Design a protein around this nucleic acid. Sequence first.
RNA 1: CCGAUAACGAACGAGACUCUGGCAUGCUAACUAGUUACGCGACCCCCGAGCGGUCGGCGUCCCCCAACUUCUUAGAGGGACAAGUGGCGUUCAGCCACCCGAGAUUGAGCAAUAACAGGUCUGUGAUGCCCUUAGAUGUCCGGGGCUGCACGCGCGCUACACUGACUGGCUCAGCGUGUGCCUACCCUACGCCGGCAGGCGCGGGUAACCCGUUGAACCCCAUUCGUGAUGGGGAUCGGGGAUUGCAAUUAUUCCCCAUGAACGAGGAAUUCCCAGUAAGUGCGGGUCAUAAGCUUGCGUUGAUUAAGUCCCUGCCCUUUGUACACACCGCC
Lengths: 189, 56, 135, 64
Amino acid sequence: DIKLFGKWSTDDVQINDISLQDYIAVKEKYAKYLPHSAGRYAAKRFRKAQCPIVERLTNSMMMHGRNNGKKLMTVRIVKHAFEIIHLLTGENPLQVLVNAIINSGPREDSTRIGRAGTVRRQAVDVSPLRRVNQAIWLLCTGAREAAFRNIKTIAECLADELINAAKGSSNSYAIKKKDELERVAKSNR
Amino acid sequence: VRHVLLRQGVLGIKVKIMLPWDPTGKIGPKKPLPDHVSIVEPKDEILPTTPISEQK
Amino acid sequence: MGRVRTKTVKKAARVIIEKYYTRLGNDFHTNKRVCEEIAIIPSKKLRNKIAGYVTHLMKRIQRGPVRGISIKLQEEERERRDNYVPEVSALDQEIIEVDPDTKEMLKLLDFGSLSNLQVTQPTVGMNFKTPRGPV
Amino acid sequence: RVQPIKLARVTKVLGRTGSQGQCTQVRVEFMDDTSRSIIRNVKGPVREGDVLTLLESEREARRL
RNA sequence: CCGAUAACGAACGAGACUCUGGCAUGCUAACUAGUUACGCGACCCCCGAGCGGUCGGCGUCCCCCAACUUCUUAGAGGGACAAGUGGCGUUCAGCCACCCGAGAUUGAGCAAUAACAGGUCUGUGAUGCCCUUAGAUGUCCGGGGCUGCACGCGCGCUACACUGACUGGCUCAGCGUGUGCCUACCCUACGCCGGCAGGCGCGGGUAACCCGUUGAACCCCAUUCGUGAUGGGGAUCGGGGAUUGCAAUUAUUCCCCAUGAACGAGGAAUUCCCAGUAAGUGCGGGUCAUAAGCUUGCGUUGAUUAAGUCCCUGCCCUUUGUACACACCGCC
Ligand SMILES: [Mg+2]
């Protein structure tokens, strides 16, 4: 009924794990016609949790100096990426994005200050909000260095980054960095 | 602020005076201090007797 | 955070409460409407802050005797202190349980052999004093 | 031989730790046994009621 | 602040205060701001609409020849107080969450005692002392210099590109300034010439009246480019044309045509920042005969992360040690 970008109904998208179903916001109460809303989502703690994850991807996809206000450009990038992944896979672009977030969120990391064993003294599991934040950041970063100095445009780079992340193939920077973080934490156990 | 030209040099004089409050305003500010709170004294208004009805 | 009131508002609130306890009420707007004529407040913000503290203090007063002076509370306390002498005293006991040593003291005083004294059996064991140190 | 991943819901937030505040320590209740609850330190914004994965079950518990 | 309490009663600072931003279809007011309605018009549809649609076209404070303040302006007022609910709390001071609300922490200004051999005598007809005072260290005039370059450092601007460059089209601001006591030098509409920088006539504005509905940039929509030191970058350098001035060389500035150098994201280090914020992006003022890579303001687009800690760098309070008191950059 809402049809983000005019298509891709939200109600069929299902989150496969209950760890992030309170922080992914694709359900009909958070379904919006367009990923652009000046919603003051940074005003209070945990307000970004109810922000739609397509809005989060749009906000985190606009980085590196040249692009700090070009939200309309980022919206068109996301729209083209959803078109490309729909043509390439056949399933819901929102479902692909949700699966990419789930498979990109690193279940644990390591953090401390003192004499480092390998990276940090302690291995610490992460919160679901940190999972979502890290996953979105990793996906956008991987798309950015995919699109930096090659003819393949940012839309296709984001598209195949999400495609690789939604399955798990070690071909996406997001899950490569996730595996690196997991190995570091396991060594720092 | 004034300067005094003494044989040894210049002497600086700074004078600050807090004007007293007055509603008249010809010796000081008309407004009171912002944090100054004044309360009017209540009267008795006891009325301890039986109810009455006075025709006027 | 950072909503602590200062002396400027607290003292003024207590003073106007103890002066106009009858006129004041538990309504913030009613209190801030009596403030303009019961007191001269240089600032609207100061006036409404004082009114809010007056509402808080009157809720506390109606739930209990706050240190702010109040004539109704004082007359109730007066009635509760300078009255309620019981019709029978607490010191007119029919029998007084008396220690034999105190009985000897009374006998030396010459007030021994009174009909209102019943001699208790003295305790045996001398087990007063708390055990010394811990454990 | 390796332990499978299992979920657990945060029941209480004890307080921050790590001496930079980067870690928050929580009391967390297992899904498979509700009577089982341990103390785990977690990083990132955490509020009570949300659920999280435990790649390894018991690591360390230490009251602040 | 509540509380204890050999203290009682005070004073400054903080707060309070002023400005600022957010709500007021509540009040007052508007031909130097408008809106609605109506009338002339201009164009499309005319199949037939017709109280159809567009007009920043003309009018209705031209005085009888419409009303009104929503929009704009600026005054008086209101409004928010931890006020209401739940929890925590010695059930105090208060804290957390929520409802209703424009707003439940908008940004600044002012800002104590005591100090520093901190900076300015190159701001002053503020100034002590010293120096000079007719071959002047006064003052004026001409020229040069303050730009000068094996090198090091700081604040910045431009970039390293395709989330882009070029070409065209579409489309949106707010601060704020504008003709001078000396003092000469203002902002500019429109028309014409020139390819551009500019030039030539006609005006308007001492200003909510004119520039100006400030047609800004970024952005948006299409074209070409295609991963190359390439249509990225525009330093260096040659020739030519204007503008200011008394004077442009050591190029004032601007315009045009050529040259496309390093630069492919930057070591060790290090700065700033929590919401309309950082950042991208242009526009005003100051400097200004000529002019901004500076600075002070304004608007446009608009996030990632965090609601914690004392780990590093520091600050405040209490206890404690001291061989320090120029006070650990000490002392020895
Ligand atoms: Mg070119």
